Design an enzyme around this catalytic site. Structure first.
Site, PDB file in Angstrom:
ATOM      1  N   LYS A   1    -125.267   0.385 -11.058  1.00 59.04           N
ATOM      2  CA  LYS A   1    -126.794   0.002 -11.738  1.00 59.04           C
ATOM      3  C   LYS A   1    -126.384   0.332 -13.272  1.00 59.04           C
ATOM      4  O   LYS A   1    -125.921   1.215 -13.522  1.00 59.04           O
ATOM      5  CB  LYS A   1    -127.755   1.010 -11.300  1.00 59.04           C
ATOM      6  CG  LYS A   1    -129.161   0.835 -12.043  1.00 59.04           C
ATOM      7  CD  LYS A   1    -130.119   1.480 -11.595  1.00 59.04           C
ATOM      8  CE  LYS A   1    -131.611   1.182 -12.150  1.00 59.04           C
ATOM      9  NZ  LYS A   1    -132.598   1.983 -11.625  1.00 59.04           N
TER      10      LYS A   1
ATOM     11  N   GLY B   1    -129.075  -7.349  -7.174  1.00 56.04           N
ATOM     12  CA  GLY B   1    -130.384  -6.717  -7.608  1.00 56.04           C
ATOM     13  C   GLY B   1    -130.645  -6.883  -8.917  1.00 56.04           C
ATOM     14  O   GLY B   1    -129.576  -6.704  -9.900  1.00 56.04           O
ATOM     15  N   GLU B   2    -131.854  -6.872  -9.634  1.00 60.43           N
ATOM     16  CA  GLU B   2    -132.068  -6.876 -10.911  1.00 60.43           C
ATOM     17  C   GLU B   2    -133.701  -6.257 -11.200  1.00 60.43           C
ATOM     18  O   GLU B   2    -134.278  -6.014  -9.956  1.00 60.43           O
ATOM     19  CB  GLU B   2    -132.230  -8.217 -11.483  1.00 60.43           C
ATOM     20  CG  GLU B   2    -133.098  -9.084 -10.949  1.00 60.43           C
ATOM     21  CD  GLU B   2    -133.153 -10.514 -11.559  1.00 60.43           C
ATOM     22  OE1 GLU B   2    -131.988 -11.049 -11.934  1.00 60.43           O
ATOM     23  OE2 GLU B   2    -134.351 -11.324 -11.618  1.00 60.43           O
TER      24      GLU B   2
ATOM     25  N   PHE C   1    -123.735   2.471  -1.301  1.00 64.30           N
ATOM     26  CA  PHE C   1    -124.596   1.260  -1.051  1.00 64.30           C
ATOM     27  C   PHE C   1    -125.560   1.543   0.078  1.00 64.30           C
ATOM     28  O   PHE C   1    -125.227   2.071   1.195  1.00 64.30           O
ATOM     29  CB  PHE C   1    -123.608   0.624  -0.369  1.00 64.30           C
ATOM     30  CG  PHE C   1    -124.236  -1.013  -0.007  1.00 64.30           C
ATOM     31  CD1 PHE C   1    -124.757  -1.655  -0.849  1.00 64.30           C
ATOM     32  CD2 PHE C   1    -124.061  -1.357   1.283  1.00 64.30           C
ATOM     33  CE1 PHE C   1    -125.406  -2.994  -0.513  1.00 64.30           C
ATOM     34  CE2 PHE C   1    -124.773  -2.418   1.850  1.00 64.30           C
ATOM     35  CZ  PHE C   1    -125.330  -3.292   0.802  1.00 64.30           C
ATOM     36  N   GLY C   2    -126.926   1.366  -0.001  1.00 62.10           N
ATOM     37  CA  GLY C   2    -127.724   1.884   0.859  1.00 62.10           C
ATOM     38  C   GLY C   2    -128.406   0.654   2.095  1.00 62.10           C
ATOM     39  O   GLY C   2    -129.268   1.076   2.698  1.00 62.10           O
ATOM     40  N   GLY C   3    -127.910  -0.431   1.863  1.00 59.73           N
ATOM     41  CA  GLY C   3    -128.176  -1.629   2.606  1.00 59.73           C
ATOM     42  C   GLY C   3    -129.275  -2.405   1.988  1.00 59.73           C
ATOM     43  O   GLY C   3    -128.948  -3.006   0.855  1.00 59.73           O
ATOM     44  N   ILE C   4    -130.072  -3.111   2.688  1.00 58.53           N
ATOM     45  CA  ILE C   4    -130.807  -4.150   2.270  1.00 58.53           C
ATOM     46  C   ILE C   4    -132.282  -3.674   2.184  1.00 58.53           C
ATOM     47  O   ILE C   4    -132.747  -3.057   2.866  1.00 58.53           O
ATOM     48  CB  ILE C   4    -130.795  -5.392   3.142  1.00 58.53           C
ATOM     49  CG1 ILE C   4    -129.350  -5.732   3.514  1.00 58.53           C
ATOM     50  CG2 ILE C   4    -131.879  -6.464   2.729  1.00 58.53           C
ATOM     51  CD1 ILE C   4    -128.831  -6.193   2.237  1.00 58.53           C
ATOM     52  N   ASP C   5    -132.899  -4.194   1.021  1.00 68.42           N
ATOM     53  CA  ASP C   5    -134.168  -3.490   0.843  1.00 68.42           C
ATOM     54  C   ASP C   5    -135.316  -4.081   1.874  1.00 68.42           C
ATOM     55  O   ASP C   5    -135.196  -5.297   2.163  1.00 68.42           O
ATOM     56  CB  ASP C   5    -134.785  -3.703  -0.640  1.00 68.42           C
ATOM     57  CG  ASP C   5    -134.793  -5.034  -1.060  1.00 68.42           C
ATOM     58  OD1 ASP C   5    -135.719  -5.915  -0.544  1.00 68.42           O
ATOM     59  OD2 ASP C   5    -133.943  -5.677  -1.787  1.00 68.42           O
TER      60      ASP C   5
ATOM     61  N   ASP D   1    -143.278   5.111  -7.733  1.00 68.66           N
ATOM     62  CA  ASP D   1    -142.877   3.813  -7.730  1.00 68.66           C
ATOM     63  C   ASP D   1    -142.239   3.383  -6.516  1.00 68.66           C
ATOM     64  O   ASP D   1    -141.146   2.350  -6.477  1.00 68.66           O
ATOM     65  CB  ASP D   1    -142.021   3.472  -8.909  1.00 68.66           C
ATOM     66  CG  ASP D   1    -141.951   1.979  -9.190  1.00 68.66           C
ATOM     67  OD1 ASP D   1    -143.006   1.445  -9.006  1.00 68.66           O
ATOM     68  OD2 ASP D   1    -141.096   1.484  -9.954  1.00 68.66           O
TER      69      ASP D   1
HETATM   70  N1  LIG Z   1    -127.821   1.713  -3.868  1.00 62.57           N
HETATM   71  C1  LIG Z   1    -128.212   0.607  -3.424  1.00 62.57           C
HETATM   72  N2  LIG Z   1    -127.940   0.030  -2.342  1.00 62.57           N
HETATM   73  C2  LIG Z   1    -128.199  -1.336  -2.132  1.00 62.57           C
HETATM   74  N3  LIG Z   1    -129.085  -2.086  -2.683  1.00 62.57           N
HETATM   75  C3  LIG Z   1    -129.379  -1.622  -4.076  1.00 62.57           C
HETATM   76  C4  LIG Z   1    -128.994  -0.208  -4.261  1.00 62.57           C
HETATM   77  C5  LIG Z   1    -129.770  -0.130  -5.710  1.00 62.57           C
HETATM   78  I1  LIG Z   1    -129.303   1.786  -6.763  1.00 62.57           I
HETATM   79  C6  LIG Z   1    -130.243  -0.998  -5.941  1.00 62.57           C
HETATM   80  N4  LIG Z   1    -130.439  -2.202  -4.856  1.00 62.57           N
HETATM   81  C7  LIG Z   1    -130.917  -3.410  -4.602  1.00 62.57           C
HETATM   82  O1  LIG Z   1    -131.085  -3.450  -6.173  1.00 62.57           O
HETATM   83  C8  LIG Z   1    -132.346  -4.179  -6.043  1.00 62.57           C
HETATM   84  C9  LIG Z   1    -133.075  -3.886  -7.286  1.00 62.57           C
HETATM   85  O2  LIG Z   1    -133.018  -2.489  -7.623  1.00 62.57           O
HETATM   86  C10 LIG Z   1    -133.049  -3.112  -5.079  1.00 62.57           C
HETATM   87  O3  LIG Z   1    -134.263  -3.925  -4.701  1.00 62.57           O
HETATM   88  C11 LIG Z   1    -132.160  -3.321  -3.792  1.00 62.57           C
HETATM   89  O4  LIG Z   1    -132.165  -4.795  -3.433  1.00 62.57           O
END
Ligand SMILES: Nc1ncnc2c1c(I)cn2[C@@H]1O[C@H](CO)[C@@H](O)[C@H]1O
Ligand code: NI
Length: 329
Positions: free
Chosen positions: A42, A22-23, A138-142, A180
């Protein structure tokens, strides 16, 4: 103690396993693994004079609110009267000094080649450059990336219920506003748990998971307080934040400013309601499900989500919605 080298946060094997996921204008997010467990890292450049992705870098003072809020929300998973796991876990935060690791540039290039990037290739930093490195669960996919991947609108309901409960618990504990919560900031991970648990002001309840656990991320614009000390991002003088177009997302910024009269230190939990409305709107208008509503019980779920959409803006907070809205009874 002072800043640490990147190798402190990313020892060689962990560095070698990084892939970019991600970015944003803020910087970069990589996934890697340690102790057999995925994490998201991050990385934000601070304190330097170079433009990065078109914007000035934050000072340490400007980045501190996000750090503090990330910690507070993570800690809710271990509290008692107001408890939720619906915000991402924060493992650590470091201040790092050095040029960008070549192995991370390699990962950056791979993403640029396959998905494309809006960012500058972060190869211009000198060895005195400072960064904040936040390591999260790691939280998965947005949700945005899952636009076409969810099974049915039944799942939408669990997602909205989890989001509402998390925000309510944070309102109650911390007078929290996310500010946000666009769909890139809603993450979905599979879970084998049938129900998820939260506690709101001492009262515990559960939510059917539909096989997914939701995590809310990115506290760059967030606000909260403890003992009357407010932590927030003052965007009163920001221009560009309020002049976006082409998505209901950009109306939310304007609607927040209307609600708070451009006074961003104040507590206006209605902003969480506005974000939840924007997310409900996405569920109904932009998400597309592998299976459509085709049974009595499911054409009814759809009707209930539509009802939520047209009534929820008459609620004062995520807490009011959770506790009073018919969708969650
Ligand atoms: N903890 C996490 N687990 C999984 N993915 C993460 C995060 C985090 I912090 C960010 N992201 C991915 O990064 C994209 C831009 O923040 C986010 O939109 C998301 O796609
Ligand atoms: Ni450390």
């Amino acid at each position: 103690k002072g800043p640490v080298p990147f190798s402190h946060c990313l020892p060689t094997e962990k560095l070698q396993r990084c892939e970019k996921i991600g970015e944003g204008v803020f910087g970069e997010v990589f996934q890697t693994i340690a102790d057999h467990t995925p994490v998201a890292i991050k990385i934000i450049a601070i304190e330097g004079p170079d433009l990065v992705n078109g914007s000035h870098q934050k000072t340490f003072e400007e980045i501190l609110p996000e750090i503090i809020i990330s910690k507070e929300l993570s800690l809710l998973s271990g509290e008692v009267c107001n408890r939720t796991e619906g915000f991402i876990g924060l493992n650590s935060v470091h201040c790092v000094q050095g040029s960008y690791p070549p192995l991370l540039l390699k990962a950056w290039d791979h993403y640029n080649s396959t998905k494309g990037s809006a960012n500058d290739r972060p190869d211009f930093f000198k060895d005195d450059q400072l960064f904040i490195v936040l390591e999260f669960e790691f939280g998965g996919i947005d949700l945005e990336q899952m636009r076409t991947k969810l099974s049915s609108l039944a799942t939408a309901k669990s997602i909205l219920h989890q989001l509402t409960a998390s925000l309510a618990v944070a309102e109650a504990s911390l007078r929290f506003e996310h500010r946000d919560l666009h769909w890139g900031n809603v993450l979905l991970k599979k879970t084998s748990l049938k129900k998820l648990h939260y506690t709101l002001n001492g009262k515990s309840s559960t939510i059917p998971s539909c096989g997914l656990q939701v995590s809310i991320i990115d506290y760059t614009l967030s606000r909260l307080e403890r003992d009357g000390i407010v932590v927030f991002c003052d965007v009163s003088m920001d221009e560009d934040l309020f002049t976006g177009d082409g998505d209901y997302q950009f109306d939310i910024y304007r609607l927040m400013k209307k609600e708070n009269n451009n006074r961003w230190g104040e507590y206006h939990p209605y902003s969480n309601v506005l974000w939840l409305h924007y997310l409900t709107d996405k569920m109904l208008k932009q998400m597309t499900f592998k299976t459509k509503c085709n049974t009595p019980a499911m054409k009814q779920i759809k009707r209930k989500i539509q009802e939520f959409h047209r009534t929820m803006l008459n609620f004062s907070s995520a807490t009011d919605l959770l506790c009073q809205h018919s969708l969650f009874k």
